[PDB]
């Protein structure tokens, strides 16, 4: 509350590190549903039902000019990557695997990282 604060944790390389955990994602052989965003004019029924589409280029552009304003953010990012392929793809198809693949991937390097 005022004047009562936990101690300070050190957040100094948090973008450095989410830059580097990006990296790891953007080159991995399942990233390829993820690496730009889904073509709208192409593909019915996207624009529609997917209210906030997200993509790894997307998440990029906002890490390197400033658009997280904390680690928390940048998950939630990432995140909604897989959420929507979840909602969009059937969990038996080459994308609906490739979408539980890279959010286990993440997760892990998340709570190693972080935790």
């Not at 793809?89 to 038996?92: K, M, R």
């Given at each position: 509350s005022m004047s009562v604060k936990k101690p300070k944790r050190d957040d100094s390389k948090d973008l450095a590190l989410c830059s580097m955990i990006l990296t790891e994602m953007e080159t991995h052989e399942d990233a390829w549903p993820f690496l730009l965003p889904v073509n709208l004019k192409l593909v019915p029924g996207y624009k529609k039902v997917i209210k906030k589409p997200m993509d790894f280029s997307t998440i990029r552009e906002k890490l390197s000019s400033g658009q997280y304003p904390n680690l928390e953010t940048f998950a939630l990012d990432v995140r909604l990557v897989f959420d929507n392929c979840e909602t969009f793809?059937?969990?038996?198809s080459d994308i609906g695997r490739a979408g539980h693949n890279m959010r286990k991937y993440f997760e892990k390097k998340w709570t190693d990282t972080f935790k």
């Open positions: 793809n059937e969990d038996d």
